Amino acid sequence: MLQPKRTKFRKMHKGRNRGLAQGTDVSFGSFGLKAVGRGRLTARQIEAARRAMTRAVKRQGKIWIRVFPDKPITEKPLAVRMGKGKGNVEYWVALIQPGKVLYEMDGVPEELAREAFKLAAAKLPIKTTFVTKTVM
Amino acid sequence: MFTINAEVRKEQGKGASRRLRAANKFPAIIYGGKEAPLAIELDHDKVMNMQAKAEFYSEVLTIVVDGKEIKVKAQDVQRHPYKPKLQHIDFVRA
Amino acid sequence: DKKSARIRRATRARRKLQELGATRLVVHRTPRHIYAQVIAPNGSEVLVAASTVEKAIAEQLKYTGNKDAAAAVGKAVAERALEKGIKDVSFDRSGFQYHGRVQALADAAREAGLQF
Amino acid sequence: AKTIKITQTRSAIGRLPKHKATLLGLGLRRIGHTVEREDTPAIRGMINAVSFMVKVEE
Amino acid sequence: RNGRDSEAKRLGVKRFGGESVLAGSIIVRQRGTKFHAGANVGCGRDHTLFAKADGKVKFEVKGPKNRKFISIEAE
RNA sequence: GCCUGGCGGCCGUAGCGCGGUGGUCCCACCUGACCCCAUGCCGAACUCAGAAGUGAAACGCCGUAGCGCCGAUGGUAGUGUGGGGUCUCCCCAUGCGAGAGUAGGGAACUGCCAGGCA
RNA sequence: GCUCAACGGAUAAAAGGUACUCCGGGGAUAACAGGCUGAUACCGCCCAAGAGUUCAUAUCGACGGCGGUGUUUGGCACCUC
RNA sequence: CCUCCUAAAGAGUAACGGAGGAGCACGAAGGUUGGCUAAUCCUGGUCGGACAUCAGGAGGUUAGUGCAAUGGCAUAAGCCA
RNA sequence: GGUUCUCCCCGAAAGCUAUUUAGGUAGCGCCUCGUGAAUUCAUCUCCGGGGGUAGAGCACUGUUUCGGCAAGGGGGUCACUUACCAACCCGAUGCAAACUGCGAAUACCGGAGAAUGUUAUCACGGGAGACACACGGCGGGUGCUAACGUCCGUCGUGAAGAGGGAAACAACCCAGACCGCCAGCUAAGGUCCCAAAGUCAUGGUUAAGUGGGAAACGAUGUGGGAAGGCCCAGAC
Ligand SMILES: [Mg+2]
Ligand SMILES: [Mg+2]
Ligand SMILES: [Mg+2]
Ligand SMILES: [Mg+2]
Ligand SMILES: [Mg+2]
Ligand SMILES: [Mg+2]
Ligand SMILES: [Mg+2]
Ligand SMILES: [Mg+2]
Ligand SMILES: [Mg+2]
Ligand SMILES: [Mg+2]
Ligand SMILES: [Mg+2]
Ligand SMILES: [Mg+2]
Ligand SMILES: [Mg+2]
Ligand SMILES: [Mg+2]
Ligand SMILES: [Mg+2]
Ligand SMILES: [Mg+2]
Ligand SMILES: [Mg+2]
Ligand SMILES: [Mg+2]
Ligand SMILES: [Mg+2]
Ligand SMILES: [Mg+2]
Ligand SMILES: [Mg+2]
Ligand SMILES: [Mg+2]
Ligand SMILES: [Mg+2]
Ligand SMILES: [Mg+2]
Ligand SMILES: [Mg+2]
Ligand SMILES: [Mg+2]
Ligand SMILES: [Mg+2]
Ligand SMILES: [Mg+2]
């Protein structure tokens, strides 16, 4: 379950998630899974989609994950009042914008790849779309 | 084979460019040589279908504006972030 | 780095003479020759100069590049300076110590009536 | 000057303070108030600030 | 463990470009020489630039470092 | 007019790099060091007295786009005002409009004084 | 000459209990209930790894995903002191 | 009390918001003159280890600043007398 | 808690600092009255400025995936190798409130100039009130980008604002009520009846009362578009 090895600071501001993505083209494989929607991808979600990818394809090809959950999210536990300091880190998310390639794959045919990503996409909270490598 | 039938842009920038992509045309630009740059608007689906082929980004291409057949190469292409559309093409002369 | 070392060694005094708006009597020294210019506060125009690489004062010297050649250049540039009307200058050693050839040149210009 | 005609078309109630001072510099006091102003870039630029709420006859 | 802060120092530029200052007028309050002192500008102990002459504030980039300098041009 | 040196402007289209090139002069190394002065050891540096030697090093000039640097047009992003929506985000009208990048440029330019060959 | 550090420093000099309690007040501020919210909870669904002798989907449904209810624990402090 | 962020490119700007410091030190660690310029790695070298000291090279401040952090600092504000 | 006749003009604040202070008070801010005085003030245009935010980017600070070029450790041999590991560097891919080799729009300071505005400005003085704010938009912290939640900034409204609209609805949309009128034009919003005004015109869409509450996902619903494979060597 992906997570930064070390971070400069423990807790990050909520921030906002505006704009189109960077990492919009397939860069390492022949095929990829691209986000259409916007929203946070948690580390558990990324591992589950990856688990479903690597099983739809059995020791076949190579898989890349283009997103990293580097943003720490906090939660006050149950029955704590408001304030008294910021909560504790519970999970890690990657902020996702419309356009972001999330995973890439080669070494398999397209049709197996359309099926692998469809199963992975069911694990994610964001609309996605299949995409192919483009020349120039 | 690739013969793009283009028109010249009368107004430029963001409003004008968005107005085009809402009308199934997209902006583009021709540069290179010592001629000045030439801003063209293309029909989207026409160019969309042709750049699906592989020999669009490798062979010489020709763009007709005002009757004049201008030969070019595809140089850079701005794709939509999350759709199979086109925002902008850079054509270099050759 | 012997060249650059001197230029960096001269910067503070030089930059300080800019801000004080003072015409500075610059000195350049080589193992052979010695030089002197009276440079205006803009730093971009000479008023008066003298040097041992000439003939008007190099035939009168055993060897250009000694304390007595310096004195000649020092006494020379002050005389040229006092004709043009130039009396108050600031000495710029330009990263050479104020010890021998430079001190000779500067000590002579003092006697010849340059205020520093 | 060519003495252009500016009429106030909308209320100044909820508008920004800069907009309200633009109206004052044009002399516009109420909806329908037509003023006569010398046509200059300065005058043309005040109109552009509050163009949403003024119509101009030339 | 994270509830402390310092009072704010009100640093920065006090007189902008072309602004006619009297001698003594502070021009920049700064931590360090973010701006350096030029003609008729003094650099104080806290590195604040102040005018030595009455005149007009002039910002300029000069030198081989492209450092930012402030000077007073007498009007 | 060409070469050199000093002082500046300008502060990388000015820099690094690479290949070539120059010694009348100037500049550099260089020769020597009782005395001037000097090394927290060293005449290496600083420094003084010099002028056999060399342009090897350096420096300067010339060349070469490997690099750095500069850099459009166009589009993209953002945004002031107004308006609107499916309102955690967006769109419309208008105005402003990047950054990155692409084509492309690019082996600085210029002044004062001095000296030297012509 | 003051960790007058509760740092614009009440006095040189100061801890508690009150269910034996009392007054002034507050819905400016808790406890009950209502209200907003729905993290939690409950209920449902999407993907289906697999279990199910074979067989994903009779039955169950890992990793994860989306909602519904106002329904538990709570959050808030808008009503009522 | 100081520093950064929050803080929306002038200043200022809140939370039992996020992160760290101070309650000193110094007659030199101050003044001035003069001089010098780091870290790190590479190559080679007695005891030498992966790292002491020496020499060169690449590097160019990726160091250093009496103590936090920020902004500064080569004309050094950094090292030496 | 309550504080008793009338009309006319102006008209806040619920902020900062400090307080055994936090529902009190004081100075400042904001109100008013008076006096005095400079294009003093505001808007737009032009000019002069500084930025380091948005966005972007990844040289730096850190963080991240892949690939390439490869020292160095360590299971064993008892130096050879090693299915493990491997930094620096190179190429590619991203992320950042406390990263910036880039960098706006806006806002702010200043100057000039015109129109414009009942001096709108500043100063001194007389009198104050106020220092519980609220919702909405924008930008944010906090919380769950939960709360009619909480804390800042900024604007607007309510507070202290009636009228019309949003069924009803302080804070939203329109719009600022001196009085009177059985006159007229419009705003938002609306025009079949309750209920003032189109059962308006042209072209289409929908068949679900969708409209007139709700997501992932599901599906020969239906409209439109771009192409394209098979097709009278006979296809579905
Ligand atoms: Mg726009
Ligand atoms: Mg106290
Ligand atoms: Mg106190
Ligand atoms: Mg007290
Ligand atoms: Mg009892
Ligand atoms: Mg009682
Ligand atoms: Mg209450
Ligand atoms: Mg409250
Ligand atoms: Mg009740
Ligand atoms: Mg009660
Ligand atoms: Mg600020
Ligand atoms: Mg601001
Ligand atoms: Mg009034
Ligand atoms: Mg207070
Ligand atoms: Mg008063
Ligand atoms: Mg950003
Ligand atoms: Mg980086
Ligand atoms: Mg109070
Ligand atoms: Mg209060
Ligand atoms: Mg408030
Ligand atoms: Mg509230
Ligand atoms: Mg009240
Ligand atoms: Mg009503
Ligand atoms: Mg009517
Ligand atoms: Mg209507
Ligand atoms: Mg009717
Ligand atoms: Mg009809
Ligand atoms: Mg319905």
Coordinates of all heavy atoms in Angstrom, one line a residue, chain I residues 164-169, ligand 23:
Chain I
rG164 P -45.0 43.8 -2.2 OP1 -46.5 43.7 -2.2 OP2 -44.3 43.2 -1.1 O5' -44.5 43.3 -3.6 C5' -45.0 43.7 -4.8 C4' -44.1 43.4 -5.9 O4' -42.9 44.1 -5.9 C3' -43.7 41.9 -6.0 O3' -44.7 41.1 -6.5 C2' -42.5 42.0 -6.9 O2' -42.8 42.2 -8.2 C1' -41.8 43.3 -6.3 N9 -41.0 43.0 -5.2 C8 -41.1 43.3 -3.9 N7 -40.2 42.9 -3.1 C5 -39.3 42.2 -3.9 C6 -38.1 41.6 -3.7 O6 -37.5 41.4 -2.6 N1 -37.6 41.1 -4.8 C2 -38.1 41.2 -6.1 N2 -37.5 40.6 -7.0 N3 -39.3 41.8 -6.3 C4 -39.8 42.3 -5.2
rG165 P -45.0 39.6 -5.9 OP1 -46.2 39.0 -6.5 OP2 -44.8 39.8 -4.4 O5' -43.7 38.8 -6.4 C5' -43.5 38.7 -7.8 C4' -42.2 38.1 -8.1 O4' -41.1 38.9 -7.7 C3' -42.0 36.7 -7.5 O3' -42.6 35.7 -8.1 C2' -40.5 36.6 -7.6 O2' -40.0 36.3 -8.9 C1' -40.0 38.0 -7.3 N9 -39.8 38.3 -5.8 C8 -40.5 39.0 -4.9 N7 -39.9 39.0 -3.7 C5 -38.8 38.2 -3.9 C6 -37.8 37.8 -3.0 O6 -37.7 38.1 -1.8 N1 -36.9 37.1 -3.6 C2 -36.8 36.7 -4.9 N2 -35.8 35.9 -5.3 N3 -37.8 37.0 -5.8 C4 -38.7 37.8 -5.2
rA166 P -43.2 34.4 -7.3 OP1 -43.7 33.4 -8.2 OP2 -44.0 35.0 -6.2 O5' -41.8 33.8 -6.7 C5' -41.0 33.0 -7.5 C4' -39.8 32.5 -6.8 O4' -39.0 33.6 -6.2 C3' -40.0 31.6 -5.5 O3' -40.5 30.3 -5.8 C2' -38.7 31.7 -4.9 O2' -37.8 30.8 -5.6 C1' -38.3 33.1 -5.1 N9 -38.6 33.9 -3.9 C8 -39.7 34.8 -3.7 N7 -39.7 35.3 -2.6 C5 -38.6 34.8 -2.0 C6 -38.0 35.0 -0.7 N6 -38.5 35.7 0.2 N1 -36.9 34.3 -0.4 C2 -36.3 33.5 -1.4 N3 -36.8 33.2 -2.6 C4 -37.9 33.9 -2.8
rA167 P -41.4 29.5 -4.8 OP1 -40.5 29.0 -3.7 OP2 -42.3 28.6 -5.5 O5' -42.4 30.6 -4.1 C5' -43.5 31.1 -4.8 C4' -44.8 30.9 -4.0 O4' -45.1 29.5 -4.1 C3' -44.8 31.3 -2.5 O3' -45.2 32.6 -2.3 C2' -45.7 30.3 -1.9 O2' -47.0 30.8 -1.8 C1' -45.7 29.1 -2.9 N9 -45.1 27.9 -2.4 C8 -43.9 27.3 -2.9 N7 -43.6 26.2 -2.5 C5 -44.7 25.9 -1.6 C6 -44.9 24.8 -0.8 N6 -44.1 23.8 -0.8 N1 -46.1 24.8 -0.1 C2 -46.9 25.8 -0.2 N3 -46.7 27.0 -0.9 C4 -45.6 26.9 -1.6
rA168 P -44.1 33.7 -1.8 OP1 -44.7 35.1 -2.1 OP2 -42.8 33.4 -2.4 O5' -44.1 33.6 -0.3 C5' -45.3 33.8 0.5 C4' -45.4 32.9 1.7 O4' -45.4 31.5 1.2 C3' -44.2 32.9 2.6 O3' -44.3 33.9 3.6 C2' -44.3 31.5 3.3 O2' -45.3 31.5 4.4 C1' -44.9 30.6 2.2 N9 -43.9 29.7 1.6 C8 -42.8 30.0 0.8 N7 -42.1 29.0 0.4 C5 -42.8 28.0 1.0 C6 -42.6 26.6 1.0 N6 -41.6 26.0 0.4 N1 -43.5 25.8 1.7 C2 -44.5 26.4 2.3 N3 -44.8 27.7 2.4 C4 -43.9 28.4 1.7
rC169 P -43.3 35.2 3.4 OP1 -43.8 36.2 4.4 OP2 -43.3 35.6 2.0 O5' -41.9 34.7 3.8 C5' -41.7 33.9 5.0 C4' -40.3 33.4 5.0 O4' -40.2 32.2 4.2 C3' -39.2 34.3 4.6 O3' -38.7 35.0 5.6 C2' -38.2 33.3 4.0 O2' -37.3 32.9 5.0 C1' -39.0 32.1 3.5 N1 -39.3 32.1 2.1 C2 -38.7 31.2 1.2 O2 -37.8 30.4 1.7 N3 -39.0 31.2 -0.1 C4 -40.0 32.0 -0.5 N4 -40.3 31.9 -1.8 C5 -40.6 32.9 0.3 C6 -40.3 32.9 1.6
Ligands
MG23 MG -45.2 36.9 -1.4

